């Protein structure tokens, strides 16, 4: 595929994905399952003013990934920008 | 052929015995190529003081044994004792013992060599009073049926060539799991969940609502013995012993030597005894309770460790049956 | 001397008569488990990635590049025209850099080498030769080796000398019309279109300078070229111009002088506040250097032979520097990269001093800074006499990272105004958006966020004010309601003869949808831009946003929209979620949404169980209710529709808990498809109990369900599939084709619609069409043969 065409399509799709999102259910289980299993995300950084989606990841781990996270010794860091600046910016206290 | 590659700090033992300075670090000494054959020697040696300080020939000491057997690699010194006759033809038995223990520790180091732990892991295990990880994890106070659950959990997720298995069944509630130190660190985390603090005090709680108290502790070894990881070595060792001319014939072994898997006598087998003993250390598990199923008033433990050794474990398995374990070393 | 070193290093006929300016090529070298074994044992790299294991591919360490690259890299110090006493040679620096993309070296691979000599300069105290090797497999670059050698002596050979440096990137803000005239002065400022407007644009000069010599001080030729780029409103840069300075005799490069004064440097390496100690580690050098020499092919006799060491005035057979490089990078790989070879991504080593066999080296290791969200790790190695021996740095990939962007509800007064005080990057985001709002819609989004105003009046006085009123009058809502689309113009109370419009809230405006939506989307975009500024954002980060997050995330990690276009879309969105529902009384709607916790009703009750109960209560009643946010498994869902049909569900659930019927025991086990009857009973008693109440009915809580307060619209539902065709045609104005970088989305963006990493394939469009039924999508699937241009 030509990059000029691939660009045209990516645009169409990206515009339709955002149009309907509005008016179709937020599928945030099937999401967390993609980034916690299919990518084995080690740090998940919540950029927000309060730690909602962090709490939701902590609980999606504690439910259906407690065994996986041991058997793969897959230590996972969940960080909210508001609460855990020091672990994101690498500025530990002396 | 490629043996010099494996002995990086050499194998000049006479030099190490004179000068404690020129002795390598413990970690090198523990590597199976040097530790395997040198444990053989330690046992054969303890056996010899025993014979000479009684004034017996090694065949005469053997004639007063009813049977002999060994845990893990100890099974080789056992079958070498069973052959011996006079002080002249002793050194042809000792050649056979330590040649086999050499090719086990050489061809098994090649098949699954120890590599660097992620230091994250090493530091996690040391702040939770678990050991330094190793390929052999020991679990006190948990039935073989309880442990085999926690490994079916852990081996659900892992792929084939990273899986753990029960290797030694030492007691009713004294098991050892063998596999990749990563994988056995996986298992250890799964256990920290289930286990309850040793300072909890459940004397106030009805019995059958109490949390399981149990100790999980890494061994000091360097290979995963009695595992599927060492199977590649099995074929190579059998061929490296037909070269160096090292069979054990059934006729030559004059006492029952007790196989470490069944408990059956090794003198009975149709095939090679040399072959079997390799599979009993490489592949197959160790069912101590069922190999030590003979009856006898007295048990000599020649092996290494002393009070921390096999003898004192064998004492607990048959406390009250009227069997005295002597720690001969 | 060179006839000897050629027999030991190179394997060709002996010919010193080739140009340094030419491109040296190596043999096609095939990596093999044998050589990676021997190499790793010679350096003490006991990292698992390099060991043969069952059901796994054996990697080669990046150190192993020099093994592949030697024949070629060293062949660059041999030509007649770079004369040098090879016994007096000193390897100063060596560097590896993985080209971004390509995976590390495997054990199957066949690696083509090409070395090029970059820079031969006579310094006062000797001659420096900078070389660059490029390792390529399957005709793609994999990594670059950058070795610099140094022939000690006295050279006056300036005819055979040259230096290509790559200058730091210089940034000019063009404020005035003299700035533009000073730049048009310069002959060397070529532009593709000379009519291009430069005013208030930001320019970046990406410049390399080739330079032949006459003496130490006077260049016999200067060249300084490479592209001029302008920052767009997305922060993407684009080539507008060329630099094209040439010259004969010159005492300097006037371009780089001009840009040092007038511009400012774009340093990629950002330092942490204070360095972070990682380790202080102890390595020995090996007693013999015959092992390393065998595997590498550095048969330099000074390392192995007491006579050559003495003839070259060294303190003995010295350790290969290239061993001390590898040794130390095996400790970087083990502590900093926690034994993941693939994380260590570039490595650079200066050889300060010499080290004899059986020395004991303390190497300190520190995390000093960040660079494109690779960690930057300065080390230094000392011998027993506390003398520095190696120094260097590593670029180490941060662990695999996902960014998740919070949606609405979390909003607070003062949010991210901490960052606004401190961060230059955050300031630029707010200030940029607050000027856009002030000028198009007559309010400051900062004021709203900083001090929650209860009321906010816009006035439409003066000429500026009439422009601001046209901007509210133009805002429509092209709804698809009825057979024929109907356009319900937002702000009906705004006509030619308005002078004011007032935004009412009860509590504060920052809780109204149309102000909250931007205040979130900024606060985030700012936080993010402050991170990106500090170099804390992995190139290969996955990103995802809950609902509104989707926008903040696509602004932040794919620069799809400008800051200005973003806050437009999001403000129009929040406005198009106020017209969307009828509110006859005042602002009260007969719609809402509740947060169900299936755990609390019954331990058995879960998925496939809510998706019946809620689907029936609506198939039965005819009152639109749906599940809208699937959040946590069997612990957090959100259902949204008719306040009536919600009040049935919070009752139907509070019945099943207190009634304590376990669904599965009577789902299929007892009676199969009769349950519809059991359920229709439980509905019709609570259904027509909540069809007789004060119209916009006070929705009460329960053990399973909590009601979300101040949420009067059912978004993420089919209700407002009707209000979409407007919004879709609105986006196609603020989101442009040119500003979509496919590379920055594909694999990385996880939509909310289709929780599947964004791809551009027939498969993915098909899966979208199945959850949408859009014609612009279906017509693409139909003629998927635009693959041919």
**Which of B113, B119, B160 is facing C338, going by the closest CB pair?**
B119
Segment 205-264 of chain B within 8 Å of chain A by CB: none
What is the signed CA dihedral for C396, C399, C403, C406, rounded to 10 degrees?
Answer: -130
The set of chains that have 3 or more CB pairs under 8 A with A is B, C
Question: Which residue is it, tokens 């256990």?
Answer: B191
Cβ count within 10 A of residue C728: 17
Residue of B31, B35, B72, B183 marked active site: B72
Q: How many residues does chain C have?
A: 789
Q: How many CB pairs under 8 A join A and C?
A: 239
* Whether C406 and A63 lie within 8 Å, measured CB to CB: no
In terms of Cα–Cα distance, which of B287, B274, B310 is closest to B103? B274
Q: With the C-alpha atoms ordered C565, C567, C572, C576, is the resulting torsion angle positive or negative?
A: positive
Interface check for C733 against chain A (CB to CB < 8 A): the answer is no
The interaxial angle of helices C675-687 and C643-659, nearest 10 deg, is 120
How far is the C-alpha of C170 from the C-alpha of C282, rounded, in Å?
42
Q: Count CB-CB contacts under 10 A for residue C232.
A: 15
Phi-psi region of C172 (alpha: psi -120 to 50; beta: other; left: phi over 0): beta
Q: C559: burial class by Cβ within 10 Å (0-12, 13-18, 19+)?
A: middle
**Would the CB atoms of A15 and C731 count as touching at under 8 Å?**
yes
Residues of chain B in contact with residue A71, where contact means CB-CB under 8 angstroms, are: 153-154, 156-158, 183, 186, 190
For residue A28, what is the domain's CATH number?
A: 3.90.25.70
Which among C67, C517, C109, C132 has a CA at the least distance from the CA of C294? C67
Phi, psi values for residue C587, rounded to 5°:
-110, 0
φ, ψ of residue C678 to 5 degrees: the values are -55, -45
Q: In 10 A of CB C430, how many CB atoms?
A: 24
Q: What is the DSSP letter of B265?
A: B
3-state percent breakdown (helix, strand, coil) of chain C, nearest 5: 35, 25, 40
* Chain A nearest CA to C299, separation (Å): 43
Question: In the PDB record, what is the listed experimental method?
Answer: cryo-EM
Per-residue DSSP letters for A9-22?
HHHHHHHHHHHTGG
Which pair of structure tokens corresponds to residue C398?
């941060």
C644 membership: H or E segment, kind and range: helix C643-659
Choose among C48, C56, C335: nearest Cβ to B115.
Answer: C48
Strands of the sheet with A77-80, listed across from one edge: A77-80, A43-47, C401-405, C542-545
H runs (alpha helix) in C297-405: 306-311, 321-335
Chains that touch C (3 or more CB pairs under 8 A): A, B
Tell me which residue range forms the domain holding A51. Answer: 1-93
Taking only residues 55 to 114 of chain C, the set having a beta carbon closer than 8 angstroms to any beta carbon of chain B reads: 55-56
Instruction: Give the bridge partners for C344, in sequence order.
Output: C396
Q: What residues of C are in contact with residue B113 (Cβ under 8 Å)? A: 51
Taking one residue from A and the other from B, the number of pairs with CB-CB distance under 8 angstroms is 31
Between CA C4 and CA B298 the distance in angstroms is 74
- Closest Cα to residue C558, out of C299, C370, C769, C750? C750
Which of C34, C47, C53 would best serve as a mutation to test chain B binding (most B beta carbons within 10 A)?
C53
At residue C769, the 3 state secondary structure works out as helix
Interface test with A, best of C429, C547, C753 (most A CBs within 10 A): C753
Q: Counting beta carbons within 10 angstroms of the beta carbon of residue C381, is it exposed (0 to 12), middle (13 to 18) or buried (19 or more)?
A: buried
Q: Is C523 helix (H, G, I), strand (E, B) or coil?
A: helix
Pairwise CB contact (< 8 Å): C716 & A25:
yes
Q: Is B6 exposed, middle or buried (0-12, 13-18, 19+ CB in 10 A)?
A: middle
Q: Exactly one of C327, C511, C547, C690 is catalytic; which is it? A: C547
Nearest to C423 by CA among C562, C275, C339, C536: C536
**Residues sharing a CB contact under 8 Å with residue C733, sequence separation 6 or more, in sequence order:** none
Residue C540 DSSP code:
T
Decide: residue A55, CB within 10 A, 0-12 exposed, 13-18 middle, 19+ buried. middle
Q: Which helix (H) or strand (E) holds C221?
A: strand C221-231
Say whether B186 and A66 touch across the interface (CB within 8 A): no
Distance CA C406, CA C418 (A): 18
Instruction: Answer whether B167's CB lies under 8 Å from B228's CB.
Output: no
Q: How far apart are alpha carbons C352 and C360 in whole angstroms?
A: 16
- Among the listed residues C103, C109, C100, the one whose alpha carbon sits nearest the alpha carbon of residue C67: C109
Collect all residues with Cβ–Cβ distance below 8 Å to C99 and sequence separation of at least 6: C141, C142, C143, C144
Please indicate whether, in this complex, the C-beta atoms of B153 and A68 are within 8 angstroms of each other: no
Q: Residue C87 gets which letter from DSSP?
A: G
Instruction: Give the residue from C381, C379, C393 showing the smallest Cα distance to C346.
Output: C393
Q: At A50, list the tokens.
A: 């309060």
Label each residue of C56-76 as H, E or C: CCCECCHHHHHHHHHHHHHHH
Contact list, B163 vs chain A (CB under 8 Å)? none
The total number of residues shown for chain A amounts to 94
Q: Which residue of B has its CA nearest to A65?
A: B157
CB contact under 8 A, C542 and A41: yes
Task: Tally Cβ neighbours within 10 Å of residue C318.
Answer: 18
Q: Which of C528, C719, C731 sits opposite A19 (nearest CB)?
A: C731
The set of residues, in sequence order, having a beta carbon less than 8 Å from that of C664 and lying 6+ positions away, is: C604
> Is beta strand C221-231 parallel, antiparallel or unpaired with respect to C208-212?
antiparallel
Please say whether the beta carbons of B304 and B279 come within 8 A. Answer: no
Tokens of C649: 């569900």
Structural tokens at position B165: 């298995």
Residue C61 backbone zone (phi > 0: left; psi -120 to 50: alpha; other: beta): beta
Note which residues in 21-60 of chain C have CB less than 8 A from chain B: 41, 46-48, 51, 53-56
φ, ψ at C49 (rounded to 5°): -65, -20
Q: How far is it, in rounded angstroms, from Cα C55 to Cα C568?
A: 53
Distance in angstroms (rounded) separating the CA atoms of residues C618 and C622: 5
Of C285, C294, C287, C40, which Cα lies nearest the Cα of B113? C40
Q: For chain A, how big is the Rg over CA atoms in Å?
A: 17
Put simply, the answer to whether A70 touches B182 (Cβ < 8 Å) is no
- How buried is C217 (Cβ within 10 angstroms: 0-12 exposed, 13-18 middle, 19+ buried)? exposed
- φ, ψ at C665 (rounded to 5°): -60, -30
Two tokens at C680?
């229709």
Q: Least CB-CB distance to A48: which of C410, C718, C760? A: C410
Hey, is B253 helix, strand or coil?
coil
Instruction: Give the Cα separation of C229 and C169 in Å (integer).
Output: 11
* Structure tokens belonging to residue C117: 């000599």
B101, two tokens: 């223990």
Number of domains in chain A: 1
Query: Would you call A73 and B153 a contact, using CB atoms and an 8 Å cutoff?
Result: no
Q: Angle between the C610-619 and C675-687 helix axes, to the nearest 10 degrees?
A: 60
- Kindly report the nearest CA distance between residue C106 and chain B, in angstroms: 19
- CA-closest candidate to residue C533, choices C235, C316, C249: C235
C194-204 in b/e form (b: 16+ CB < 10 A) is: eeeebeeeebb
Give CA separation, C686 vs C122, C421, C653, in Å.
93, 54, 11
Of C85, C200, C76, nearest in space to C132 by CA: C76
Closest chain A residue by Cα to residue C403:
A45
Do C78 and C15 form a contact (C-beta atoms < 8 A)? no
Residue A54 CB: number of other CB atoms within 10 A? Answer: 22
DSSP string, C722-774: SS-HHHHHHHHHHS-STT--GGGTTTTB--SSS-S----SHHHHHHHHTTT--
Can you read off the two tokens belonging to residue A91? 């500025």
**CB distance C406–A41 less than 8 Å?**
no
For residue C342, indicate whether it is catalytic: no
Which residues, other chains included, contact B4 with Cβ-Cβ below 8 Å and sequence gap of 6+? none
Residues from chain C that touch A8, judged by Cβ atoms under 8 A, are: 737
Half-sphere exposure of C691 (CA within 13 A, CB side): 10
Distance between A67 CA and the closest CA of chain B, angstroms: 7
| Cα–Cα–Cα angle for C42, C47, C53, rounded to 5 degrees | 105
- Among residues C503, C494, C433, which one has the least CA distance to residue C468? C494
Supply the DSSP string of C368-431, one letter for each residue. Answer: EEEETTEEEEEEEEE-TT--EEEEEEEEEEPPPEEEEE--TT---TTTTHHHHHH-HHHHHHHH
Q: Does C544 touch chain A (CB under 8 A)?
A: yes
User: What does the block give as tokens for B11?
Assistant: 């194998």
Cβ atoms of residues C491 and C475 within 8 Å: yes
- C545 has which bridge partners? C405
DSSP-assigned letter for residue C580 = S
CB contact under 8 A, C54 and B119: no
- Which one, of B237, B264, B268, lies nearest residue B253 by Cα? B268
Interface membership of B5 toward C (CB under 8 Å): yes
DSSP string for residues in B164-229:
-EEEEEEETTEEEEES-HHHHHHHHHHHHHH---SS---SSS-GGGSPPP-EEEE-S-SS-TTSST
**Resolution attained, angstroms:** 2.9
H helix or E strand, kind and range, residue C273? strand C270-284
Write the DSSP assignment of A10-68 as a string of letters.
HHHHHHHHHHTGGGS-EEHHHHHHIIIIIS--SEEEEESSS-HHHHHHHHHHHHHSHHH
Report how far apart, in Å, the C-alpha atoms of B72 and of each of B277, C141, C149 are: 9, 51, 56
Q: CA torsion sign, C502 to C506 to C509 to C512?
A: negative
């Amino acid at each position: 595929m030509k990059p000029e065409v691939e660009q045209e399509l990516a645009h169409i799709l990206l515009t339709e994905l955002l149009a309907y999102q509005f008016a179709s259910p937020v599928r945030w289980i099937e999401t967390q399952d993609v980034f916690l299993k299919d990518f084995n995300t080690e740090r998940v950084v919540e950029i927000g003013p309060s730690p909602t989606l962090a709490g939701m990841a902590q609980r999606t781990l504690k439910n259906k990934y407690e065994s996986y996270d041991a058997a793969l010794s897959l230590h996972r860091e969940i960080l909210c920008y508001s609460k855990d600046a020091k672990e994101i910016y690498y500025t530990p206290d002396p | 052929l490629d043996a010099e590659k494996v002995f990086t700090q050499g194998l000049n033992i006479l030099e190490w015995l004179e000068n404690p300075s020129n002795t390598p670090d413990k970690d090198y000494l523990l590597s199976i190529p040097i530790s395997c054959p040198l444990i053989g020697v330690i046992q054969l040696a303890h056996y010899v003081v025993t014979a000479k300080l009684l004034g017996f020939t090694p065949g005469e000491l053997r004639s007063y044994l009813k049977g002999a057997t060994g845990h893990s690699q100890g099974l080789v010194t056992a079958v070498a004792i069973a052959e011996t006759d006079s002080w002249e033809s002793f050194f042809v038995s000792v050649r056979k013992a330590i040649t086999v223990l050499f090719f086990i520790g050489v061809r098994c180091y090649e098949a699954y060599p120890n590599t660097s732990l992620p230091p994250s892991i090493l530091e996690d295990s040391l702040e939770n009073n678990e050991g330094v990880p190793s390929p052999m994890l020991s679990i006190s106070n948990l039935t073989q049926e309880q442990v085999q659950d926690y490994v079916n959990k852990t081996n659900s997720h892992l792929p084939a060539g990273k899986q753990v298995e029960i290797s030694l069944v030492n007691g009713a509630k004294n098991l050892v799991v063998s596999g990749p130190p990563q994988s056995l660190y996986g298992l250890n985390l799964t256990l920290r969940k289930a286990k309850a603090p040793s300072g909890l005090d459940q004397s106030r709680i009805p019995f059958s609502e109490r949390k399981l108290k149990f100790s999980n502790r890494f061994l000091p070894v360097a290979s995963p013995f009695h595992s599927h990881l060492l199977v590649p070595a099995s074929d190579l060792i059998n061929k490296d012993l037909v070269k160096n001319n090292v069979s054990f014939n059934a006729k030559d072994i004059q006492i029952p030597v007790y196989d470490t898997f069944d408990g059956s006598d090794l003198r009975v087998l149709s095939g090679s005894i040399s072959e079997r003993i390799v599979d009993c250390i490489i592949r197959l598990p160790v069912k101590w309770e069922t190999t030590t199923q003979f009856k006898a008033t007295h048990i000599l433990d020649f092996g290494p460790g002393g009070a921390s050794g096999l003898g004192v474990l064998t004492h607990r398995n048959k406390d009250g049956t009227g069997v005295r374990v002597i720690v001969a070393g | 001397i060179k006839e000897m070193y050629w027999k030991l290093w190179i394997d060709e006929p002996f010919n010193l008569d080739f140009d340094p300016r030419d491109v040296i090529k190596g043999k096609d070298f095939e990596i093999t488990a044998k050589e990676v074994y021997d190499f790793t044992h010679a350096v003490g790299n006991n990292c698992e990635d390099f060991v043969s294991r069952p059901d796994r591919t054996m990697l080669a360490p990046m150190d192993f590049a020099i093994v592949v690259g030697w024949r070629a890299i060293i062949k660059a110090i041999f030509p007649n025209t770079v004369d040098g006493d090879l016994l007096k040679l000193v390897h100063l620096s060596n560097g590896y850099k993985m080209i971004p993309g390509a995976k590390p070296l495997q054990v199957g691979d066949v690696v083509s080498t090409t070395a090029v000599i970059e820079s031969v300069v006579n310094q006062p105290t000797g001659k420096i030769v900078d070389v660059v090797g490029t390792l390529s497999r399957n005709g793609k670059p994999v990594m670059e080796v950058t070795s610099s050698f140094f022939y000690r002596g006295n050279y006056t050979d300036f005819e055979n000398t040259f230096q290509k440096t790559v200058e730091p990137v210089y940034q000019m803000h063009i404020k005035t019309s003299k700035d533009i005239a000073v730049l048009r002065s310069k002959e060397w400022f070529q532009l593709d279109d000379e009519d291009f407007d430069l005013l208030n644009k930001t320019l970046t000069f990406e410049t390399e300078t080739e330079v032949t010599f006459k003496n130490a001080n006077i260049f016999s030729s200067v060249k300084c070229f490479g592209p001029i780029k302008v920052e767009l409103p997305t922060k993407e840069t684009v080539e507008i111009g060329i630099v094209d300075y040439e010259a004969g005799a010159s005492h300097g490069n006037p371009v780089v002088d001009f840009l040092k004064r007038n511009g400012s440097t774009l340093e990629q390496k950002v330092n942490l506040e204070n360095p972070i100690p990682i380790a202080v580690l102890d390595s020995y050098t090996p007693s013999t250097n015959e092992p390393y020499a065998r595997v590498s092919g550095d048969l330099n006799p000074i390392h192995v032979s007491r006579h050559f060491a003495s003839y070259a005035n060294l303190p003995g057979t010295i350790t290969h520097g290239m061993f001390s490089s590898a040794s130390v990078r095996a400790l970087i790989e083990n502590w900093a990269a926690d034994s993941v070879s693939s994380r260590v991504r570039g490595y650079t080593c200066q050889f300060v001093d010499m080290v004899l066999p059986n020395t004991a080296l303390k190497t300190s290791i520190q995390h000093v800074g960040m660079i494109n969200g690779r960690k930057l790790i300065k080390f230094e190695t000392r011998n027993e006499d506390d003398v520095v021996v190696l120094t260097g740095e590593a670029e180490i990939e941060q662990p695999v990272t996902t960014f998740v962007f919070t949606g609405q509800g979390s909003q607070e007064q003062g949010m991210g105004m901490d960052l606004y005080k401190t961060s230059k990057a955050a300031q630029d985001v707010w200030n940029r958006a607050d000027n856009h709002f002030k000028d198009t819609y007559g309010f400051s989004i900062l004021d709203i966020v900083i001090n929650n105003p209860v009321n906010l009046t816009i006035h439409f006085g003066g000429e500026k004010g009439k422009r601001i009123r046209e901007n509210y009058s133009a805002m429509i809502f092209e709804t698809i309601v009825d057979g024929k689309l109907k356009t319900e113009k937002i702000f009906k109370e705004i006509n030619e003869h308005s002078t004011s419009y007032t935004f009412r809230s009860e509590k504060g405006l920052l809780s109204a949808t149309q102000f909250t939506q931007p205040a979130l989307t900024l606060m985030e975009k700012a936080a993010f831009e402050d991170l990106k500024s500090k170099g804390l954002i992995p190139a290969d980060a996955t990103f995802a946003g809950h609902s509104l997050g989707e926008y903040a995330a696509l602004a932040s990690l794919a620069d799809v929209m400008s800051i200005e276009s973003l806050v437009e879309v999001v403000f129009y969105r929040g406005m198009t979620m106020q017209v969307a529902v009828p509110r006859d009384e005042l602002g009260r709607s007969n719609y809402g949404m509740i947060a169900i916790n299936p755990g609390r009703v019954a331990a058995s009750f879960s998925q496939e169980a809510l998706q019946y109960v809620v689907e029936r209560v609506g198939k039965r009643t005819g009152w639109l209710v749906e599940i809208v946010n699937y959040n946590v498994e069997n612990q957090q869902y959100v259902a949204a529709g008719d306040l009536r049909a919600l009040d049935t569900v919070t009752n139907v659930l509070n019945f099943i808990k207190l009634q304590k019927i376990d669904i599965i025991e009577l789902q299929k086990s007892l009676s199969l498809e009769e349950v519809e009857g059991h359920l229709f009973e439980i509905i019709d008693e609570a259904s027509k109990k909540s069809a007789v109440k004060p119209r916009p009915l006070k929705l009460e809580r329960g053990f399973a369900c909590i009601p979300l307060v101040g949420i009067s619209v059912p978004f993420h539902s089919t209700y407002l599939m009707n209000g979409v065709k407007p919004f879709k045609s609105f986006l196609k104005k603020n989101i442009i084709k040119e500003n979509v970088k496919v590379a920055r989305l594909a694999g990385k963006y996880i939509p909310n619609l289709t929780a599947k990493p964004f791809q551009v394939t027939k498969e993915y469009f098909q899966d979208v069409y199945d959850l949408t039924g859009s014609e612009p999508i279906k017509e693409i699937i139909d003629n998927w043969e635009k693959y041919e241009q």
